[PDB]
Amino acid sequence: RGEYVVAKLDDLVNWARRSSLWPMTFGLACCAVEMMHMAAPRYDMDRFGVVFRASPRQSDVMIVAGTLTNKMAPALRKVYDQMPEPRYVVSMGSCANGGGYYHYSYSVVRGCDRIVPVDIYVPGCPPTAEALLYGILQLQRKIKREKRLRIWYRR
Amino acid sequence: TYKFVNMREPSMDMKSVTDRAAQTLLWTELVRGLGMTLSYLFREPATINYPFEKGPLSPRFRGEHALRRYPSGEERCIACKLCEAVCPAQAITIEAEPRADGSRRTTRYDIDMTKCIYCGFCQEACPVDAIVEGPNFEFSTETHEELLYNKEKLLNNGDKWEAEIAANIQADYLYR
Amino acid sequence: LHHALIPHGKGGRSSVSGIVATVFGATGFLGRYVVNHLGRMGSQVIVPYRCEPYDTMHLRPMGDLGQIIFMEWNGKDKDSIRKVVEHSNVVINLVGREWETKNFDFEDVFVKIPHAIAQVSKEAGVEKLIHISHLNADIKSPSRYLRSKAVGEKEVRAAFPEATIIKPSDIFGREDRFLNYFASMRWFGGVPLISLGKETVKQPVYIVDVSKGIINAIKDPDAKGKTFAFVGPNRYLLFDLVQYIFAVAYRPFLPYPLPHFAYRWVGRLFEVSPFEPWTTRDKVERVHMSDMTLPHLPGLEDLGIQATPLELKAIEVLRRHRTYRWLTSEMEDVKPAKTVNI
Amino acid sequence: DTRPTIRPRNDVVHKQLSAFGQYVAEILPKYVQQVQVSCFNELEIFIHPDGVIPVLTFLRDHTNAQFKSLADLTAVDVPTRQNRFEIVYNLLSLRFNSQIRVKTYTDELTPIESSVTVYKAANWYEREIWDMFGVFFANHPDLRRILTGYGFEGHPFRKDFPLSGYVELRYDDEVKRVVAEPVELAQEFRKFDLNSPWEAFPAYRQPPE
Amino acid sequence: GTSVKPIFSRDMNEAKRRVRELYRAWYREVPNTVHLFQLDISVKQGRDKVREMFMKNAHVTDPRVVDLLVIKGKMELEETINVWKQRTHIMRFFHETEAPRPTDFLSKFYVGHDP
Amino acid sequence: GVRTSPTGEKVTHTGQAYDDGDYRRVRFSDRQKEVNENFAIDLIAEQPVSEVGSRVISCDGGGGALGHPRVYINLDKETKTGTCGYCGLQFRQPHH
Amino acid sequence: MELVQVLRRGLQQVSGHGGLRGYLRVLFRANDVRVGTLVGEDKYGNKYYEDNKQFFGRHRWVIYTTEMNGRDTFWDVDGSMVPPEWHRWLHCMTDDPPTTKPPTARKYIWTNHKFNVSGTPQQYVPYSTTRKKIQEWVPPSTPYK
């Protein structure tokens, strides 16, 4: 039946997307250091299929790791625009989540969500590299639960 | 006491210069560089098998905030507002009101995880060990609003991680 | 008003406005824009959706955290509509489709679904329901889109007597399928106007104008029961309109008269596609109807919003279509297309 | 020791710093207004704002001073003073391993000669004082905002400036742009009035006026 | 006491001269911003905004103040020239997303408790 | 004990329940109202009142450093039982 | 000599994991084939192994349960599937497993360790936990006038 065929196509495409999540080298602050430590041998992003890649044209997930300030927010929004779809935003740290320590400052965006649609909120100051890996795996399951071709079949 | 890190003049004996020319032509330190990486590939990798294998922690680890309670069942919090008055990020909001029994307990105890800095200052300030930073750190959420913790959510965390948090405090209270 | 619906603040994101609303079909064109305005003033939006949640991602960052709430709903399920409209002051109906899918014809998305929305909204107890139709809505128009829209308007009026009915003429914007349609027609050789397109008069209205009109109608205490008609300020001849569209895009213009039945065949051929049907018979028809002037119906100016002429807001739409050659030319380089006087 | 908690006090350094303070006061009586050594052995020279270029140069070039490193250059804003802005120069002498402080005053609309000619490190520092406080430094190679965002309106570090500013940022889909809006916080900064109404230190007791 | 140091100009006329040449630079610039920054507002729609910005602080009379805003406007021109400001930074001058605010007392009373 | 409001919303220990004519309940549909079933108001009630045989008694909450600051309760009024202000445990003189 | 023993213990790898079928089960599920002493098991089904010979970090590990709380976890697993009592032992925060040293029991402690409830309709929605502050006048019902 057509539903089974589109189901299997959904599983294949979602598996590819979740098993080759290519992130972006967009570290901003101390939350980037853990972003490096999970790339360090101990946790090693590489075994999970995730390999760092600059040039947003060839990346899927943006881990906004660090404080997002007013002077940088236009750059972050523009760079998010460069990403071809599908795209995902993982927010690392309290600063990139809702403001963190400098939530009441004059030149800090009170949450990265106000600029891009954040897909996964990873809490911490900074989050432990295990916690960030957990957030990435949660995003992976999110991609696994996508129903693109199913919705197309029931257009 | 100081040392000259790069103050070495190379010897100009015929043997020395022959060795330098051999290293230049027949790449020698380059071969050493290859050999080092060969030696480490043959070595054991350091990666752990997350999530089936977890990196080591300590009983002092700071994670998800949680409200504890006495063994009787009554909450430890008495709304003294030390944690709210000491939080560097002003992430705690407390509203108190005398309960029906008479004990002073928070009618609202909200901790904003999206604004928290996980310093642990609240758990030091608490005179009754009511608010603690639990061992949990894998509590990422898909939406922002789920990170704005209420009193009920914090009490649920306290009731859930109580087995771990009681042991962690038991193994660390003597240092404090 | 309830104790939490009393307006508070200064109109910013974190301000209680009291416009708790449901926008059916928010995931597309004006459905996005309206939400933005609803998000801007600080109103709790109960945006329902049937598509993949990823497609609702651009819906997320226009409201303060906790304001926008997404729910799953199905057109042929009264329980879903009841769930989404149970706690809401206003229910805005923006459900539509330029084509007829296999599981949804024109009547389903313009009569049946609006009927269910209006009936369930009346049962729940909402105070305002803004239904959206087309200006050229007629029970005898050849295109099934406009005919279905007319019967849907009558049904919605019957079910919700005080429902505000807004009849926009033609929305042009960054994603409009009206200016981008003409611009994208460059791929298929020349632009094949029917009878050279010298008999059709179109009155396009800016998207921001329509969304602001919806917001004002919600805020206006007299929009209940009324039937507004949202049209642009000028009336363009279709050939002159395409001339302006291709001049602002600086693409070569190759007009080509085309017999009506041959264009119907072309529309069928494009309808065959099991994906986004670039052109349908309804589509090729509608671009040939003139915009029926309805002076009796109240307009945008009554709501207090001045229509923005297409010339000022045409560079936004067609700057993407320009090649690298005329990618930086200013807005005043191309002279406004001559307009037949209203 | 008899004082296991009280920080040890060095008096030889106090005598040396006092001697050098008198030395500098005698050398440049034109600008040196008042010199004082703190209890923790730090010497501060308060000069007239016209003595910014001369005095620094002396401290940079004299054989007995040899202060050849501008460690820090900052300003402190005290609204209750006439010339609220108070520019502070911190200098370090590597030959006599000694730190000196030269502090001058300036109001909102009075310029200060740029010390870029003397201390080329000041070039960026000056801009910061301009950006954070608004003190304009004349004869500067290039004065510009260094920390605030482009198009910022105001001087953040001024006391008469809210810590949350006046304008926040957002992304608007209608204009497809990162727009700026008037500030509106979800939770207002709870201003805590923590100050004991009992005098703390009898030593620093201001005489009544 | 009543007499204090000058910034750049030594009278109001020289300050007006500096204001005049700053307006010269801005007026000459504006179309270059419209083209280079890919703005969609009309050229005149930016020149009149330059005029309005100049007319905003047209009430000041202390010379030193006038030199101060001359330097500040020079800095903003400097940012605009070498693409240091961006499209969003320039567009902030035209407050677009801001809803229009009312001026009559009656609407303010209807909308909220503010002066 | 947690009970149900007429709308259907469970009331918390703080007596919080959104009104029927309140739009905020929209947040809870397709979700649940996170409440704590273990009510401290009830849980402290059935704890037995200790028959202390002295005029005053010291309570630390149990565990020394694990408990609350030690406070001394005066058990002199025969009409009431001395209750610690930190943990809520009651004490009573042996029938005086 | 060590080559032969090395080839041999690769067969103890398949023998320990209940034969070939269990060998591919653990290989495709937990991505490892290493064996270890069964330190314990929890009520949810996760099996908890330890091998002190492994270097610090992989001396203890979990094979997660196939099913927990009405959710198939045969293929998708996460770090929140660890019950609180065993999370201490797994993360090397103690050397006492719950089997030997069991955590103290109390009434308020849960009996079913819910995993991360994000995404599922059992999410957490923030809300005000306080009552109203200002009351209304509730005008009388008699027309009177």
Ligand SMILES: COC1=C(OC)C(=O)C(C/C=C(\C)CC/C=C(\C)CC/C=C(\C)CC/C=C(\C)CC/C=C(/C)CC/C=C(/C)CC/C=C(\C)CC/C=C(\C)CC/C=C(\C)CCC=C(C)C)=C(C)C1=O
């Ligand atoms: C001082 O402060 C600092 C900060 O302070 C705040 C900072 O923030 C930052 C900034 C922060 C960062 C940079 C973050 C940290 C980043 C890192 C540490 C980087 C870590 C990187 C890694 C772990 C990964 C490195 C990558 C490696 C080792 C290898 C990559 C190589 C690859 C090959 C990757 C794979 C990619 C590709 C494209 C291959 C896949 C493609 C294929 C297989 C295609 C196959 C196709 C087919 C088979 C087709 C077959 C067709 C057939 C048969 C027929 C077809 C014909 C038809 C007709 C259809 C820095 C630097 C900083 O310093």
Ligand SMILES: NC(=O)C1=CN([C@@H]2O[C@H](COP(=O)(O)OP(=O)(O)OC[C@H]3O[C@@H](n4cnc5c(N)ncnc54)[C@H](OP(=O)(O)O)[C@@H]3O)[C@@H](O)[C@H]2O)C=CC1
């Ligand atoms: N020029 C114009 O386009 C004019 C349009 N209108 C009316 O405005 C409304 C919105 O127009 P516009 O935003 O451009 O349209 P779009 O096609 O861009 O968006 C239509 C919306 O309706 C939803 N929808 C369609 N069919 C169904 C269905 N069967 N069940 C559930 N949801 C459904 C879509 O969901 P999804 O995104 O998942 O498909 C989407 O959210 C329509 O009623 C249209 O006729 C009025 C005047 C002029």
Ligand code: SF4
């Ligand atoms: S959340 Fe904490 S660690 Fe992350 S950037 Fe902000 S302050 Fe640094």
Ligand code: SF4
């Ligand atoms: S640990 Fe968290 S809640 Fe406690 S004071 Fe620090 S930031 Fe606030």
Ligand code: SF4
């Ligand atoms: S410090 Fe402890 S007892 Fe005091 S209010 Fe905070 S949680 Fe309650």
Ligand SMILES: [Zn+2]
């Ligand atoms: Zn007690």
